[PDB]
């Protein structure tokens, strides 16, 4: 239920050896007092399974690698043994208690309810095969219709929590289609803060977006990542997908945002970065997003996948907005603005060019940097005929293919 | 917990004191939210000049 | 196995008694099936379709990673050193 | 020693600025931006960067 999220957190930094040390250490505590009291022993146990040689490895009921940099993971044999006792005890009480439920009568209510108790306790442990099937009891039976998506949702958290994207993808499928069907409101507000964490992970973080305004309006707690990482994660996907004008408003409709202050590092290494943007501070910009690099992406278990890909594109969004707004610029006071040198910046800019999402060119004789992007006639009839000519490939094979049948 | 026990006229200087906390958060949303519970509650008539004035 | 996504050309054409051989003839002119020969052939494993995370397996939407840097290493650096020259001018 | 005077002394400063700059390069094309710092009464780089962001 609610631990899940906190462990899988911390358990993510274990993953990771390119985080600080003193993260790591800290994280690896924090694991090892909850697997002794709630059980996170099979979860300690899938850690390894997504190492076998590599780093965030120390494991000792399984793989070692002490050459790792972590060396705060390794297992006991205390551990091995402290799992198979509350394993097996906890299971056969709890079950014996279920099948007096069976025996009495009453199963509208009662015995689907109690179903549900079992797969919490599994979910909670991080098996999920064995929630899967005892939650795939609770739906068999007919109960309330709001109470089904609150169960498929607690199936969903247990993708994040061993970070397989396609068991949520699979998932969330099926909350949608009963999302309307119960037509409540409550969980609707949980559904798109899965979904948007689903769209994090993806690399469409335009619809991620317009999930993740709707959940910082109204939040719902309960089984979901902590309301400080929400907003980061609000921030993260409104640097990448809007521009100046629209982040501001963005962020000013979200009073949230502002009154929550900076609580936590990666919220505040995101936020700083947030108001230079859209105030169009470049000086301090150019730092800003190194620190992003570090307490956010690699930190998350979402932004991991994109701690090469967000680099990349970000610095195409402020040199962008700069060049739109000016016909010709100095090269030297290009670089000065942002805090490079002159042959430093060129290396950046000549990647973003050639695939033609910064419209520009480079004199490196007047060192001036020319901008000439079409914005007229010109660039929406060169948008146009990409469309049209797709829509003439969709024919050719749709008409062939009905003529010769 | 003053709802259950309102008779008050001492939470009209609550609501002031909880908008002026919103405004200096920097949300307005919720500063005006209780600005207007403020107002509301000081038409009833046993308002100090002080607390109308605040 | 299709060649990009796979239910865009799964329904131009589905199972006919017809075509089915002719599918085979097809194959069988080139000589193999080109999926099979190349393992047998490398006499192990590949690690050049490890050689990116989506190139083994896609589950993702294509990046346009190929070259896959570390663009944090070199930008701290570009900071820091630019920073340098000036005060040391 | 009031935030609300350095708040709208600071809005009041950026449309003031706004109003003036509009007004002294619409007879223009292709200006100077050392004739706008000077009518303006403000400086070149300073001027550069307010167009920057209208």
Known sequence: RVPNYEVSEKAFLLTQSKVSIEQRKEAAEFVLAKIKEEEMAPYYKYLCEEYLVNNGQSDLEHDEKSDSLNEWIKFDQELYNELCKKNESKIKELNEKIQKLEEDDEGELEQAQAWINLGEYYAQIGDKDNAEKTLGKSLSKAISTGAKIDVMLTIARLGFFYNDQLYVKEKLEAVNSMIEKGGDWERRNRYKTYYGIHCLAVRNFKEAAKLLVDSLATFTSIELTSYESIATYASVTGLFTLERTDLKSKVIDSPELLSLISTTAALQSISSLTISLYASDYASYFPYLLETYANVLIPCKYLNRHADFFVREMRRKVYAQLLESYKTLSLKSMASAFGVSVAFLDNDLGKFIPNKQLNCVIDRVNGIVETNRPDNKNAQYHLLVKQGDGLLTKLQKYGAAVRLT | ?54 | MSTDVAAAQAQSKIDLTKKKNEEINKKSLEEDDEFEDFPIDTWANGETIKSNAVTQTNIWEENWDDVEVDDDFTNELKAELDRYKRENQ | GDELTRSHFNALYDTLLESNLCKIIEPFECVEISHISKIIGLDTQQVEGKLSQM
Do not use: G, M, W
């Open chain 2, 1 to 54: 917990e003053f709802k259950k026990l309102d008779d008050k006229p001492s939470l009209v200087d609550v609501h002031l004191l909880e908008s002026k906390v919103y405004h200096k958060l920097r949300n307005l949303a919720k500063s005006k939210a209780s600005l207007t519970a403020a107002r509301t509650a000081a038409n009833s008539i046993y308002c100090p000049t002080q607390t109308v004035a605040e």
